Symmetry: C2
Subunit: 29 residues, 2 copies
Amino acid sequence: MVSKLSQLQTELLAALLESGLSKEALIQA
Amino acid sequence: MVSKLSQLQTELLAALLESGLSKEALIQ
């Protein structure tokens, strides 16, 4: 069900939050 | 003011939303 694109998005979203980006900033952008 | 890490985060955010990820998933 999950495409390579969705898997890459999932992994980058996770890496962004682990790197310190706030959920609020995540939201705005 | 903006570090390399912050700049990379900004660029990846841009790219994620342009790729089609919803703001809702983004926030979740």
